[PDB]
Amino acid sequence: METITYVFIFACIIALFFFAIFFREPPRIT
Amino acid sequence: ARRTWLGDILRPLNSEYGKVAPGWGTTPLMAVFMGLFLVFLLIILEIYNSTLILDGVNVSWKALG
């Protein structure tokens, strides 16, 4: 259960990476 | 809407929305397959249930050896 917890948390981080890059608030120029 | 190479190839497969054979068309024939299928499922069921007993159909694990 300890191995699982570590891999689960690492997997959520990588999923976060994907939305942080591709689903960011896009920057705009005013 | 976006056109894509693949979209264009599949196009005629989503081209006839709403087109119908008039009246009853093939309903009477579908009806035949439906009743045939029912009778076939009955057989299948009454074999499993052992109310239909047939020659050389031993409905037991012992039909594995």
Binding site: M1, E2, T5, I9 | -
Partner: protein, 32 residues
Amino acid sequence: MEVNQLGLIATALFVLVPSVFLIILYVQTESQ
């Protein structure tokens, strides 16, 4: 391995509870 079995619930709420707080604050922002 003979680990602390309250470690799972501790890790679990450590993640969930502050995580939940932030989602709540982000969504009610997007809807005004």
